[PDB]
Structure formats: C-alpha cells, structure tokens
Amino acid sequence: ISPIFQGGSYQLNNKSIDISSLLLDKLSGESQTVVMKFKADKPNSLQALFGLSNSKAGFKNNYFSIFMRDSGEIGVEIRDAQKGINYLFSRPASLWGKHKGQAVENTLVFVSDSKDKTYTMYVNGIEVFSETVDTFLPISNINGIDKATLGAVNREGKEHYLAKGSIDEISLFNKAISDQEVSTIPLSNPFQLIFQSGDSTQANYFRIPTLYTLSSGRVLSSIDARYGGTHDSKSKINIATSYSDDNGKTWSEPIFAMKFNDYEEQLVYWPRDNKLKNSQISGSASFIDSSIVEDKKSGKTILLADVMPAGIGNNNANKADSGFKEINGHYYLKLKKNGDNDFRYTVRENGVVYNETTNKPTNYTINDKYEVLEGGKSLTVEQYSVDFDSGSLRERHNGKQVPMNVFYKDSLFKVTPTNYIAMTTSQNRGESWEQFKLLPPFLGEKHNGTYLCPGQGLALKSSNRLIFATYTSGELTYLISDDSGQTWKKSSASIPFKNATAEAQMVELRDGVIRTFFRTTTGKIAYMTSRDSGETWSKVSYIDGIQQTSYGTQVSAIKYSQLIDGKEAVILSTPNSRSGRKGGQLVVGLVNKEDDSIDWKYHYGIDLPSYGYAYSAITELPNHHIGVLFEKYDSWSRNELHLSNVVQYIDLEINDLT
Ligand SMILES: O=S(=O)(O)[C@]1(CNC2CCCCC2)C[C@@H](O)[C@@H](O)C1
C-alpha cells in the first residue's frame, strides 16, 4: 500500500506545524501506521512529535500523540473523553540522540491495528511495546478530531508539549502494516545488535556485556542471557557468547558457554507495572557476570562466571561458607542429602559421593556436568516453566525431565546455598565450550566465593600469566594462573571499602606493570598498581575528572596498541554522571612515562548526557577501531527494568574520540 501522506524537512523549533489539510480528509478506516524519521539531539523534557486532536474548547482530552522525553523514552497517548478512554503506552530508553558528533536519524514506526486491537511501537528496528486492549480506540475515530500537528498537540486551540528537533520524513498509511513489512523499512541505525530477543538463547533480556580480541583477529563477546526480566540472581540466567570474524561487522548466532536446564529457556515479556515488576524467578539455578581471557600457551580461550544454586543470589548467599570442605590439602564439594539438615557428604576423586559421617563411599557419583548418578545411571528431575497466567508469577513443573544437577532445587544431593566461580574453556575460539568446573575456594572454609569482575581477564604480554580480577568485602582478590588455568592462586589487595561492589578491570601499562581501575562508593573511579605482574598491589588512588553515582557503575578499560599524541594510551568506558547511569563516555588517557601517571586528555560522549549508559565492554578491533558493547539504559533505575534489545554495539575510530 502507499502512504496517504508523506512530508519531510520539518524543523521543530518550539512551534507546532499544522498539517491538517494534507492529512485529515485522508484518514480512513480504523487501522493506521505512522512512519517517522526524526532527529532530536536537544529535546525538551517532554515533547510531542506528532498529534491528532479535537482542538475545540471542552475537549482537551480528545487526542492521539506520539511523544518522547529527554530520557530517551518514547510513547503514545490515545484519549477520548466521551468513550471514557485514556490509554498511555511507553518505554524508557528507546531512542538515540547523537553519534560521532551528529544527530542520529531515528526510525519510528507505530502500528494501530483495529483487527487485533493492538498498538505496537518500533524504534530503530526494535519493538519497544505491543499492547492489546479490550476496547480499541482507532486514532482517527477520536471524537471531534480536527487538527493534525507536528511538534505539538493542539488542545483548546493552544500548543502543548512543544518539541525541539526535526522530522526529516513522516508517512501515514491507512493500514496496520505487518511485522514482516516493518522489517523492510530502511534504517539509519548507528548501532547493531549481537544478542537480541528471539535469537537462539531465547532470553528476552541481556545484561553484562563483554568483548575480547583474540590473537586470530576474531572478536568474542559474552553476556548474561537473562530470562526472568533483567533482575540479578536469584533468577534464570545463562552465559551466551557470539563472535565476529570481520572486525565486528557481523556476528555469529549465539551459543551457551554455561547453562542450566532446571528451568525452560523461555522468551517471556516480564511485567513492568509497579505491582509485579519485582516478580523474580526464585527456584532456578543461574550463572551471572562473565569474563573472558585468551591464553597464549595453550591457545585456549577461558571464560569464568559466578554460579548460583537454585534460588540463590548475592542477597541470600551464605557469606560464611565456601561450600567446600578442606581435607589435607584438598577441597571437596560438600553435599546435603534430601532429609538431612546438615551436609553429611562430599564429592571426592572420580566424582565419588562420600559419607563424611561413616567415612564410606555411597553408590552415587557426580559426573563432569555436576549431574547425579546412582550405580552409574542418570537420575532426573522434572523441569520448571514460568507463567503469569494467574495474574502473579508462577513457577511449575512442565512434564519434561532433565538430568539431576547438584545445583538444582529438586536434586537429591544439594550444594551449599552460596555463590561460586566456575570456569569453562574453548579450544576453537568460541565455537563450542567445555563443561564448566568450579574454581577452588581462595579465602578459606568459612567465606563465600568472591564476585567475578565482568569483562576481560588479563593476559600478560611477556609471560603466560593469566589474571582474573574478583571482589569481596574489603578487598580485590586477583585470581592468577601460570598454567593455562589448570591451577589458581589469589593475590589480595585491601581496599578501604566495606562491602562495595568493587568491579575492577585491568590494563598492562608496560611489561609487568598492571593498573586496575575499579568502581567504588565514593562517586569516583579508583585505581591501584602492580609492578609485580600481579603479585603485590599499591595503595588506592582516585581519578579526579570522572563522576559516578554514590553506588557506582562497572568501568571497562583497555590499553590502546597505538600511540596517541606520541604517548601510550589507556581508554576507559563509563557513565560520567553523579545522578544516574547515563552520559556514557570513552575517556582517553595518555601515560606519563616518568611516573606511570595518566593525563585524562579526551572525553568522547557516546550519546546525550541524559541518555542511558550502564555496564560496558570495550575492545580494540584488529583494524584499530574501538568496539563498544554496552547497556544503553539506566540499569540502576527502578523505572527502566525489563527492557529488551538495549545492549547494543557500536564501532568507533580514534579520530572520533580525539
Ligand atoms: O593485548 S591483549 O591483552 O592480548 C588484547 C588484544 N590486543 C590486540 C592487539 C592488536 C590489535 C587488537 C588488539 C587487548 C585486550 O583488551 C583484549 O582484547 C586482548
């Protein structure tokens, strides 16, 4: 079908443009699609892009509008006072503002479908909301419509919600165009997606991106595939990965690096209302926060992540129990058997389950997938699915059987309800992953596992040493391996913080010199230095010149391979704001060779200061561009929970940053 209306080059400068004569006599039938290509790099706090209204006195609540906020939110209102209808649909963090110094051309598509009674909004190729209603209100059937407006809504002859921006193209169709059709509309996106709703992971949500450039030139990314909305554990979360062989132009279909099957992989639209949004999958095991390094020695890629047993998260994990019994030099995974109130068992060599109370072996063994065997045979549990059919979250058996895992709720033998760190490896650069193995405890029998710092581990240039930063109360705990991850030891570095989420990332400044940058509770990013290849660590200092909130945000960090301004360069990625997770920046620092101090010389704004930017991943692509994969939303805000396709990837060049 053809647009009944098509116009462009509309400058919105706090003055509505009336297009009533061009549009009103052509609105026909009860279904409409609006396609709008627009820019808004300096929007007012709340502004209408498009409006259809009854403009007469006494009918100020009879209008349809497409609006946006300076937070990046997009939405519509559909109101008819005589029909008693006041629909408001919206989603935070739906828009781009600027990219590489220029206003981004957003592509917006809104479908009002009478036949299915559904209102669906797409922005930049992403469906941000789709709402079906009992009583449908066609946008052209609003009682007394007599004005079509750009850059405002006309109410009682007055302009409301005045917009600043530009509508470069707007088209209206007297049809609800299909999802298939929407997919054919040309986009001008400054970003691409690696992980996305509906892909192979079947997670509707993603969080905690990573990026790492392998020696082959392949770029690898890992991520939390989060099923129960965007909530941290407890939940159902798997670790997924994808790789690019063409400097980030295209990405492979995701696979799992670490997964559990106690709950079904379900694509679920998690409720965003104020009654149900804290609904949380509470009976599932999960992985959370992954980190990647490549080992020169073996050529293996190594991925670590936190492991959470069923129903466990960092809020309810036992802080005073490692889950391992130390017996003469060795650490054995403790198990509790159904019926017992204590942990009377351990897993010894060859997976044998040993009764600690009789000092004798049982006929149970644990396999390499942490599954339970009895006399060599696989025990099973019934899998769970989740639904909101009853108006609240329900977790229930679905009739499918899966291998019994010691991390599961229904298992005969259960691990200690605390957090662990697991490792997996890949021999083919991310095409497949090994079964995970638990790392040993590093802080004794009576201390929970440390928390993995999301992002990259560090492979030292002049040795085969591998380092993964972790944090716990009062210290950073670096996990160090010199034998391709076969064995590990800790190096503790005290930090003057009680129970801080001290997410840390490292760069090798020069041979044997490591600087770690980390999140704090002070509003400032901190750092410490090793000249020991990680053996010992300096006192803590702070970067003055970048602001975080009181609660802080993960910071990603790389050492650039090329000189900038004749100096060695470190690039940081972080929100730069004392209010929320927004105002994302790359910050380029130049290293002063005399004291290893860094002058933070250039700040590049990823998008508008008011637009969302949370956890992030950066890596130098093999062609010396910078790849950035980041959460484009405020992942702290309780208004921006459960958003799909907000983890996005961009390509930048150094000249863009300087
Ligand atoms: O120097 S490495 O530590 O092996 C690494 C890769 N360096 C190449 C050097 C050549 C250009 C691309 C980046 C940097 C980290 O951010 C990881 O991406 C791995």
mmCIF file with all atom_site columns, N, CA and C in Angstrom, residues 542-605:
data_model
loop_
_atom_site.group_PDB
_atom_site.id
_atom_site.type_symbol
_atom_site.label_atom_id
_atom_site.label_alt_id
_atom_site.label_comp_id
_atom_site.label_asym_id
_atom_site.label_entity_id
_atom_site.label_seq_id
_atom_site.pdbx_PDB_ins_code
_atom_site.Cartn_x
_atom_site.Cartn_y
_atom_site.Cartn_z
_atom_site.occupancy
_atom_site.B_iso_or_equiv
_atom_site.pdbx_formal_charge
_atom_site.auth_seq_id
_atom_site.auth_comp_id
_atom_site.auth_asym_id
_atom_site.auth_atom_id
_atom_site.pdbx_PDB_model_num
ATOM 1   N N  . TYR A 1 542 ? 42.498 7.743  43.365 1.00 0.00 ? 542 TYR A N  1
ATOM 2   C CA . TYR A 1 542 ? 41.239 8.046  42.691 1.00 0.00 ? 542 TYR A CA 1
ATOM 3   C C  . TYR A 1 542 ? 41.436 8.917  41.465 1.00 0.00 ? 542 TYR A C  1
ATOM 4   N N  . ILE A 1 543 ? 40.654 8.648  40.433 1.00 0.00 ? 543 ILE A N  1
ATOM 5   C CA . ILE A 1 543 ? 40.608 9.538  39.293 1.00 0.00 ? 543 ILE A CA 1
ATOM 6   C C  . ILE A 1 543 ? 39.699 10.726 39.597 1.00 0.00 ? 543 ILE A C  1
ATOM 7   N N  . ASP A 1 544 ? 40.284 11.915 39.609 1.00 0.00 ? 544 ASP A N  1
ATOM 8   C CA . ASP A 1 544 ? 39.510 13.136 39.696 1.00 0.00 ? 544 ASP A CA 1
ATOM 9   C C  . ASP A 1 544 ? 39.331 13.585 38.251 1.00 0.00 ? 544 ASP A C  1
ATOM 10  N N  . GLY A 1 545 ? 38.091 13.829 37.845 1.00 0.00 ? 545 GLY A N  1
ATOM 11  C CA . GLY A 1 545 ? 37.813 14.186 36.462 1.00 0.00 ? 545 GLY A CA 1
ATOM 12  C C  . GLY A 1 545 ? 36.715 13.360 35.806 1.00 0.00 ? 545 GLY A C  1
ATOM 13  N N  . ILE A 1 546 ? 36.279 12.302 36.486 1.00 0.00 ? 546 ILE A N  1
ATOM 14  C CA . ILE A 1 546 ? 35.155 11.488 36.018 1.00 0.00 ? 546 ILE A CA 1
ATOM 15  C C  . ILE A 1 546 ? 34.243 11.312 37.219 1.00 0.00 ? 546 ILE A C  1
ATOM 16  N N  . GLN A 1 547 ? 32.937 11.436 37.013 1.00 0.00 ? 547 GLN A N  1
ATOM 17  C CA . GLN A 1 547 ? 31.987 11.286 38.107 1.00 0.00 ? 547 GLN A CA 1
ATOM 18  C C  . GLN A 1 547 ? 31.152 10.038 37.924 1.00 0.00 ? 547 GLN A C  1
ATOM 19  N N  . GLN A 1 548 ? 30.919 9.339  39.025 1.00 0.00 ? 548 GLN A N  1
ATOM 20  C CA . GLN A 1 548 ? 29.947 8.269  39.077 1.00 0.00 ? 548 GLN A CA 1
ATOM 21  C C  . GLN A 1 548 ? 28.964 8.614  40.179 1.00 0.00 ? 548 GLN A C  1
ATOM 22  N N  . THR A 1 549 ? 27.906 7.828  40.276 1.00 0.00 ? 549 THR A N  1
ATOM 23  C CA . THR A 1 549 ? 26.962 7.963  41.363 1.00 0.00 ? 549 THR A CA 1
ATOM 24  C C  . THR A 1 549 ? 27.574 7.403  42.630 1.00 0.00 ? 549 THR A C  1
ATOM 25  N N  . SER A 1 550 ? 26.912 7.649  43.759 1.00 0.00 ? 550 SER A N  1
ATOM 26  C CA . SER A 1 550 ? 27.309 7.084  45.045 1.00 0.00 ? 550 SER A CA 1
ATOM 27  C C  . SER A 1 550 ? 27.417 5.561  44.995 1.00 0.00 ? 550 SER A C  1
ATOM 28  N N  . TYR A 1 551 ? 26.558 4.907  44.216 1.00 0.00 ? 551 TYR A N  1
ATOM 29  C CA . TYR A 1 551 ? 26.584 3.444  44.168 1.00 0.00 ? 551 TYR A CA 1
ATOM 30  C C  . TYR A 1 551 ? 27.551 2.908  43.107 1.00 0.00 ? 551 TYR A C  1
ATOM 31  N N  . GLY A 1 552 ? 27.859 3.739  42.111 1.00 0.00 ? 552 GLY A N  1
ATOM 32  C CA . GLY A 1 552 ? 28.899 3.411  41.136 1.00 0.00 ? 552 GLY A CA 1
ATOM 33  C C  . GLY A 1 552 ? 28.437 2.530  39.992 1.00 0.00 ? 552 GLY A C  1
ATOM 34  N N  . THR A 1 553 ? 29.298 2.338  38.998 1.00 0.00 ? 553 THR A N  1
ATOM 35  C CA . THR A 1 553 ? 28.939 1.523  37.847 1.00 0.00 ? 553 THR A CA 1
ATOM 36  C C  . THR A 1 553 ? 30.201 0.832  37.373 1.00 0.00 ? 553 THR A C  1
ATOM 37  N N  . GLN A 1 554 ? 30.071 -0.348 36.772 1.00 0.00 ? 554 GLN A N  1
ATOM 38  C CA . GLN A 1 554 ? 31.227 -1.019 36.171 1.00 0.00 ? 554 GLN A CA 1
ATOM 39  C C  . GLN A 1 554 ? 31.962 -0.090 35.202 1.00 0.00 ? 554 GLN A C  1
ATOM 40  N N  . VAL A 1 555 ? 33.292 -0.193 35.175 1.00 0.00 ? 555 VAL A N  1
ATOM 41  C CA . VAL A 1 555 ? 34.110 0.573  34.241 1.00 0.00 ? 555 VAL A CA 1
ATOM 42  C C  . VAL A 1 555 ? 34.945 -0.408 33.428 1.00 0.00 ? 555 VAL A C  1
ATOM 43  N N  . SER A 1 556 ? 34.942 -0.261 32.110 1.00 0.00 ? 556 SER A N  1
ATOM 44  C CA . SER A 1 556 ? 35.774 -1.125 31.287 1.00 0.00 ? 556 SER A CA 1
ATOM 45  C C  . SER A 1 556 ? 36.995 -0.339 30.833 1.00 0.00 ? 556 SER A C  1
ATOM 46  N N  . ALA A 1 557 ? 38.091 -1.047 30.578 1.00 0.00 ? 557 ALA A N  1
ATOM 47  C CA . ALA A 1 557 ? 39.370 -0.380 30.365 1.00 0.00 ? 557 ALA A CA 1
ATOM 48  C C  . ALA A 1 557 ? 40.283 -1.186 29.461 1.00 0.00 ? 557 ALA A C  1
ATOM 49  N N  . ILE A 1 558 ? 40.887 -0.517 28.476 1.00 0.00 ? 558 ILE A N  1
ATOM 50  C CA . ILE A 1 558 ? 41.888 -1.150 27.619 1.00 0.00 ? 558 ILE A CA 1
ATOM 51  C C  . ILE A 1 558 ? 43.124 -0.276 27.447 1.00 0.00 ? 558 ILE A C  1
ATOM 52  N N  . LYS A 1 559 ? 44.232 -0.919 27.097 1.00 0.00 ? 559 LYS A N  1
ATOM 53  C CA . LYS A 1 559 ? 45.422 -0.213 26.661 1.00 0.00 ? 559 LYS A CA 1
ATOM 54  C C  . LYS A 1 559 ? 45.436 -0.244 25.141 1.00 0.00 ? 559 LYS A C  1
ATOM 55  N N  . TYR A 1 560 ? 45.457 0.929  24.519 1.00 0.00 ? 560 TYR A N  1
ATOM 56  C CA . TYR A 1 560 ? 45.436 1.019  23.064 1.00 0.00 ? 560 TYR A CA 1
ATOM 57  C C  . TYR A 1 560 ? 46.798 0.601  22.499 1.00 0.00 ? 560 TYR A C  1
ATOM 58  N N  . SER A 1 561 ? 46.798 -0.033 21.329 1.00 0.00 ? 561 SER A N  1
ATOM 59  C CA . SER A 1 561 ? 48.026 -0.591 20.783 1.00 0.00 ? 561 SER A CA 1
ATOM 60  C C  . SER A 1 561 ? 48.871 0.490  20.121 1.00 0.00 ? 561 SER A C  1
ATOM 61  N N  . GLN A 1 562 ? 48.235 1.596  19.743 1.00 0.00 ? 562 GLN A N  1
ATOM 62  C CA . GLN A 1 562 ? 48.937 2.654  19.016 1.00 0.00 ? 562 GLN A CA 1
ATOM 63  C C  . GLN A 1 562 ? 49.178 3.871  19.895 1.00 0.00 ? 562 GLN A C  1
ATOM 64  N N  . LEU A 1 563 ? 50.219 4.642  19.578 1.00 0.00 ? 563 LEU A N  1
ATOM 65  C CA . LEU A 1 563 ? 50.446 5.907  20.269 1.00 0.00 ? 563 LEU A CA 1
ATOM 66  C C  . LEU A 1 563 ? 49.360 6.907  19.898 1.00 0.00 ? 563 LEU A C  1
ATOM 67  N N  . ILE A 1 564 ? 48.998 7.754  20.855 1.00 0.00 ? 564 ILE A N  1
ATOM 68  C CA . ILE A 1 564 ? 48.160 8.919  20.588 1.00 0.00 ? 564 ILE A CA 1
ATOM 69  C C  . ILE A 1 564 ? 48.941 10.128 21.112 1.00 0.00 ? 564 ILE A C  1
ATOM 70  N N  . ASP A 1 565 ? 49.049 11.177 20.299 1.00 0.00 ? 565 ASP A N  1
ATOM 71  C CA . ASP A 1 565 ? 49.872 12.334 20.653 1.00 0.00 ? 565 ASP A CA 1
ATOM 72  C C  . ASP A 1 565 ? 51.281 11.919 21.086 1.00 0.00 ? 565 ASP A C  1
ATOM 73  N N  . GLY A 1 566 ? 51.812 10.892 20.429 1.00 0.00 ? 566 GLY A N  1
ATOM 74  C CA . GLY A 1 566 ? 53.147 10.389 20.713 1.00 0.00 ? 566 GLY A CA 1
ATOM 75  C C  . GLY A 1 566 ? 53.271 9.653  22.036 1.00 0.00 ? 566 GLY A C  1
ATOM 76  N N  . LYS A 1 567 ? 52.144 9.428  22.710 1.00 0.00 ? 567 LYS A N  1
ATOM 77  C CA . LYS A 1 567 ? 52.177 8.767  24.012 1.00 0.00 ? 567 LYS A CA 1
ATOM 78  C C  . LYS A 1 567 ? 51.356 7.483  24.063 1.00 0.00 ? 567 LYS A C  1
ATOM 79  N N  . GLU A 1 568 ? 51.639 6.662  25.066 1.00 0.00 ? 568 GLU A N  1
ATOM 80  C CA . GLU A 1 568 ? 50.879 5.446  25.282 1.00 0.00 ? 568 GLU A CA 1
ATOM 81  C C  . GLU A 1 568 ? 49.514 5.840  25.816 1.00 0.00 ? 568 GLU A C  1
ATOM 82  N N  . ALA A 1 569 ? 48.485 5.097  25.412 1.00 0.00 ? 569 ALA A N  1
ATOM 83  C CA . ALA A 1 569 ? 47.111 5.488  25.711 1.00 0.00 ? 569 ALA A CA 1
ATOM 84  C C  . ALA A 1 569 ? 46.321 4.375  26.378 1.00 0.00 ? 569 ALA A C  1
ATOM 85  N N  . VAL A 1 570 ? 45.496 4.775  27.338 1.00 0.00 ? 570 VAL A N  1
ATOM 86  C CA . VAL A 1 570 ? 44.553 3.909  28.019 1.00 0.00 ? 570 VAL A CA 1
ATOM 87  C C  . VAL A 1 570 ? 43.179 4.511  27.738 1.00 0.00 ? 570 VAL A C  1
ATOM 88  N N  . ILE A 1 571 ? 42.198 3.668  27.418 1.00 0.00 ? 571 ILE A N  1
ATOM 89  C CA . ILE A 1 571 ? 40.849 4.150  27.162 1.00 0.00 ? 571 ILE A CA 1
ATOM 90  C C  . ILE A 1 571 ? 39.880 3.554  28.181 1.00 0.00 ? 571 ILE A C  1
ATOM 91  N N  . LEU A 1 572 ? 39.098 4.419  28.836 1.00 0.00 ? 572 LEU A N  1
ATOM 92  C CA . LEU A 1 572 ? 38.119 3.993  29.841 1.00 0.00 ? 572 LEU A CA 1
ATOM 93  C C  . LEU A 1 572 ? 36.707 4.141  29.305 1.00 0.00 ? 572 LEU A C  1
ATOM 94  N N  . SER A 1 573 ? 35.803 3.246  29.707 1.00 0.00 ? 573 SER A N  1
ATOM 95  C CA . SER A 1 573 ? 34.389 3.354  29.320 1.00 0.00 ? 573 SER A CA 1
ATOM 96  C C  . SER A 1 573 ? 33.546 3.350  30.582 1.00 0.00 ? 573 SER A C  1
ATOM 97  N N  . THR A 1 574 ? 32.643 4.322  30.693 1.00 0.00 ? 574 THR A N  1
ATOM 98  C CA . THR A 1 574 ? 31.898 4.513  31.927 1.00 0.00 ? 574 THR A CA 1
ATOM 99  C C  . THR A 1 574 ? 30.845 5.577  31.731 1.00 0.00 ? 574 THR A C  1
ATOM 100 N N  . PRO A 1 575 ? 29.745 5.478  32.486 1.00 0.00 ? 575 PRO A N  1
ATOM 101 C CA . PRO A 1 575 ? 28.905 6.672  32.521 1.00 0.00 ? 575 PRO A CA 1
ATOM 102 C C  . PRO A 1 575 ? 29.704 7.774  33.209 1.00 0.00 ? 575 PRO A C  1
ATOM 103 N N  . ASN A 1 576 ? 29.410 9.028  32.894 1.00 0.00 ? 576 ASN A N  1
ATOM 104 C CA . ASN A 1 576 ? 30.059 10.133 33.583 1.00 0.00 ? 576 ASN A CA 1
ATOM 105 C C  . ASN A 1 576 ? 28.949 11.024 34.082 1.00 0.00 ? 576 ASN A C  1
ATOM 106 N N  . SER A 1 577 ? 28.479 10.738 35.290 1.00 0.00 ? 577 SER A N  1
ATOM 107 C CA . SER A 1 577 ? 27.320 11.425 35.840 1.00 0.00 ? 577 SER A CA 1
ATOM 108 C C  . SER A 1 577 ? 27.241 11.137 37.331 1.00 0.00 ? 577 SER A C  1
ATOM 109 N N  . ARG A 1 578 ? 26.838 12.124 38.118 1.00 0.00 ? 578 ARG A N  1
ATOM 110 C CA . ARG A 1 578 ? 26.663 11.866 39.532 1.00 0.00 ? 578 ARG A CA 1
ATOM 111 C C  . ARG A 1 578 ? 25.205 11.586 39.904 1.00 0.00 ? 578 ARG A C  1
ATOM 112 N N  . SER A 1 579 ? 24.317 11.494 38.905 1.00 0.00 ? 579 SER A N  1
ATOM 113 C CA . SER A 1 579 ? 22.874 11.331 39.133 1.00 0.00 ? 579 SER A CA 1
ATOM 114 C C  . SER A 1 579 ? 22.363 9.917  38.865 1.00 0.00 ? 579 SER A C  1
ATOM 115 N N  . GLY A 1 580 ? 22.796 9.338  37.746 1.00 0.00 ? 580 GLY A N  1
ATOM 116 C CA . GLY A 1 580 ? 22.300 8.038  37.328 1.00 0.00 ? 580 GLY A CA 1
ATOM 117 C C  . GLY A 1 580 ? 23.242 7.377  36.334 1.00 0.00 ? 580 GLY A C  1
ATOM 118 N N  . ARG A 1 581 ? 22.833 6.245  35.779 1.00 0.00 ? 581 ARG A N  1
ATOM 119 C CA . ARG A 1 581 ? 23.677 5.572  34.800 1.00 0.00 ? 581 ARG A CA 1
ATOM 120 C C  . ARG A 1 581 ? 23.345 6.094  33.416 1.00 0.00 ? 581 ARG A C  1
ATOM 121 N N  . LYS A 1 582 ? 23.999 7.208  33.089 1.00 0.00 ? 582 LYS A N  1
ATOM 122 C CA . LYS A 1 582 ? 23.738 7.958  31.858 1.00 0.00 ? 582 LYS A CA 1
ATOM 123 C C  . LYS A 1 582 ? 24.971 8.784  31.511 1.00 0.00 ? 582 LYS A C  1
ATOM 124 N N  . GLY A 1 583 ? 24.940 9.449  30.359 1.00 0.00 ? 583 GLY A N  1
ATOM 125 C CA . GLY A 1 583 ? 26.080 10.243 29.929 1.00 0.00 ? 583 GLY A CA 1
ATOM 126 C C  . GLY A 1 583 ? 27.324 9.401  29.698 1.00 0.00 ? 583 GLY A C  1
ATOM 127 N N  . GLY A 1 584 ? 27.167 8.324  28.935 1.00 0.00 ? 584 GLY A N  1
ATOM 128 C CA . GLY A 1 584 ? 28.285 7.441  28.645 1.00 0.00 ? 584 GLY A CA 1
ATOM 129 C C  . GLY A 1 584 ? 29.425 8.122  27.926 1.00 0.00 ? 584 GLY A C  1
ATOM 130 N N  . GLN A 1 585 ? 30.651 7.813  28.355 1.00 0.00 ? 585 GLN A N  1
ATOM 131 C CA . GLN A 1 585 ? 31.842 8.364  27.725 1.00 0.00 ? 585 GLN A CA 1
ATOM 132 C C  . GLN A 1 585 ? 32.922 7.327  27.506 1.00 0.00 ? 585 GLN A C  1
ATOM 133 N N  . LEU A 1 586 ? 33.708 7.513  26.447 1.00 0.00 ? 586 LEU A N  1
ATOM 134 C CA . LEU A 1 586 ? 35.035 6.926  26.412 1.00 0.00 ? 586 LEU A CA 1
ATOM 135 C C  . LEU A 1 586 ? 36.003 8.035  26.828 1.00 0.00 ? 586 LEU A C  1
ATOM 136 N N  . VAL A 1 587 ? 36.937 7.723  27.719 1.00 0.00 ? 587 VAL A N  1
ATOM 137 C CA . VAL A 1 587 ? 37.889 8.723  28.181 1.00 0.00 ? 587 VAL A CA 1
ATOM 138 C C  . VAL A 1 587 ? 39.276 8.220  27.836 1.00 0.00 ? 587 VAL A C  1
ATOM 139 N N  . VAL A 1 588 ? 40.011 9.016  27.069 1.00 0.00 ? 588 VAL A N  1
ATOM 140 C CA . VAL A 1 588 ? 41.341 8.624  26.631 1.00 0.00 ? 588 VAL A CA 1
ATOM 141 C C  . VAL A 1 588 ? 42.381 9.263  27.530 1.00 0.00 ? 588 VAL A C  1
ATOM 142 N N  . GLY A 1 589 ? 43.220 8.432  28.137 1.00 0.00 ? 589 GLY A N  1
ATOM 143 C CA . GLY A 1 589 ? 44.297 8.936  28.964 1.00 0.00 ? 589 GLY A CA 1
ATOM 144 C C  . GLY A 1 589 ? 45.639 8.648  28.328 1.00 0.00 ? 589 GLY A C  1
ATOM 145 N N  . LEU A 1 590 ? 46.572 9.596  28.452 1.00 0.00 ? 590 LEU A N  1
ATOM 146 C CA . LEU A 1 590 ? 47.925 9.419  27.936 1.00 0.00 ? 590 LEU A CA 1
ATOM 147 C C  . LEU A 1 590 ? 48.893 9.166  29.086 1.00 0.00 ? 590 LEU A C  1
ATOM 148 N N  . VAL A 1 591 ? 49.756 8.166  28.933 1.00 0.00 ? 591 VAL A N  1
ATOM 149 C CA . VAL A 1 591 ? 50.626 7.752  30.035 1.00 0.00 ? 591 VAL A CA 1
ATOM 150 C C  . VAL A 1 591 ? 51.903 8.589  30.108 1.00 0.00 ? 591 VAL A C  1
ATOM 151 N N  . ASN A 1 592 ? 52.140 9.193  31.269 1.00 0.00 ? 592 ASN A N  1
ATOM 152 C CA . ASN A 1 592 ? 53.393 9.892  31.518 1.00 0.00 ? 592 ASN A CA 1
ATOM 153 C C  . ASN A 1 592 ? 54.450 8.863  31.909 1.00 0.00 ? 592 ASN A C  1
ATOM 154 N N  . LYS A 1 593 ? 55.428 8.654  31.031 1.00 0.00 ? 593 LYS A N  1
ATOM 155 C CA . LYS A 1 593 ? 56.447 7.617  31.216 1.00 0.00 ? 593 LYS A CA 1
ATOM 156 C C  . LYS A 1 593 ? 57.344 7.820  32.440 1.00 0.00 ? 593 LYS A C  1
ATOM 157 N N  . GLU A 1 594 ? 57.277 8.993  33.054 1.00 0.00 ? 594 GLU A N  1
ATOM 158 C CA . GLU A 1 594 ? 58.188 9.289  34.153 1.00 0.00 ? 594 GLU A CA 1
ATOM 159 C C  . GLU A 1 594 ? 57.691 8.711  35.482 1.00 0.00 ? 594 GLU A C  1
ATOM 160 N N  . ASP A 1 595 ? 56.371 8.620  35.641 1.00 0.00 ? 595 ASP A N  1
ATOM 161 C CA . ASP A 1 595 ? 55.807 8.096  36.882 1.00 0.00 ? 595 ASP A CA 1
ATOM 162 C C  . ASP A 1 595 ? 54.626 7.145  36.677 1.00 0.00 ? 595 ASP A C  1
ATOM 163 N N  . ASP A 1 596 ? 54.368 6.771  35.425 1.00 0.00 ? 596 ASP A N  1
ATOM 164 C CA . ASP A 1 596 ? 53.227 5.920  35.074 1.00 0.00 ? 596 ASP A CA 1
ATOM 165 C C  . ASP A 1 596 ? 51.878 6.569  35.413 1.00 0.00 ? 596 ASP A C  1
ATOM 166 N N  . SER A 1 597 ? 51.891 7.877  35.643 1.00 0.00 ? 597 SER A N  1
ATOM 167 C CA . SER A 1 597 ? 50.655 8.624  35.823 1.00 0.00 ? 597 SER A CA 1
ATOM 168 C C  . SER A 1 597 ? 49.978 8.844  34.475 1.00 0.00 ? 597 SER A C  1
ATOM 169 N N  . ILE A 1 598 ? 48.672 9.097  34.511 1.00 0.00 ? 598 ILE A N  1
ATOM 170 C CA . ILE A 1 598 ? 47.885 9.228  33.291 1.00 0.00 ? 598 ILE A CA 1
ATOM 171 C C  . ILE A 1 598 ? 47.173 10.578 33.239 1.00 0.00 ? 598 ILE A C  1
ATOM 172 N N  . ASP A 1 599 ? 47.352 11.315 32.144 1.00 0.00 ? 599 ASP A N  1
ATOM 173 C CA . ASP A 1 599 ? 46.615 12.560 31.917 1.00 0.00 ? 599 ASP A CA 1
ATOM 174 C C  . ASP A 1 599 ? 45.360 12.284 31.086 1.00 0.00 ? 599 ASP A C  1
ATOM 175 N N  . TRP A 1 600 ? 44.188 12.389 31.712 1.00 0.00 ? 600 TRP A N  1
ATOM 176 C CA . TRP A 1 600 ? 42.919 12.126 31.023 1.00 0.00 ? 600 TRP A CA 1
ATOM 177 C C  . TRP A 1 600 ? 42.549 13.290 30.098 1.00 0.00 ? 600 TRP A C  1
ATOM 178 N N  . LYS A 1 601 ? 42.890 13.143 28.823 1.00 0.00 ? 601 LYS A N  1
ATOM 179 C CA . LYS A 1 601 ? 43.001 14.279 27.902 1.00 0.00 ? 601 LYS A CA 1
ATOM 180 C C  . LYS A 1 601 ? 41.781 14.493 27.008 1.00 0.00 ? 601 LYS A C  1
ATOM 181 N N  . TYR A 1 602 ? 41.124 13.406 26.623 1.00 0.00 ? 602 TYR A N  1
ATOM 182 C CA . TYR A 1 602 ? 39.980 13.490 25.729 1.00 0.00 ? 602 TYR A CA 1
ATOM 183 C C  . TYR A 1 602 ? 38.783 12.750 26.332 1.00 0.00 ? 602 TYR A C  1
ATOM 184 N N  . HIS A 1 603 ? 37.592 13.346 26.229 1.00 0.00 ? 603 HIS A N  1
ATOM 185 C CA . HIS A 1 603 ? 36.338 12.701 26.645 1.00 0.00 ? 603 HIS A CA 1
ATOM 186 C C  . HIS A 1 603 ? 35.414 12.605 25.419 1.00 0.00 ? 603 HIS A C  1
ATOM 187 N N  . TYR A 1 604 ? 35.019 11.397 25.012 1.00 0.00 ? 604 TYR A N  1
ATOM 188 C CA . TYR A 1 604 ? 34.039 11.261 23.925 1.00 0.00 ? 604 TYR A CA 1
ATOM 189 C C  . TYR A 1 604 ? 32.673 10.849 24.449 1.00 0.00 ? 604 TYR A C  1
ATOM 190 N N  . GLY A 1 605 ? 31.652 11.644 24.150 1.00 0.00 ? 605 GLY A N  1
ATOM 191 C CA . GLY A 1 605 ? 30.304 11.321 24.592 1.00 0.00 ? 605 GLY A CA 1
ATOM 192 C C  . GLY A 1 605 ? 29.609 10.341 23.636 1.00 0.00 ? 605 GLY A C  1
#
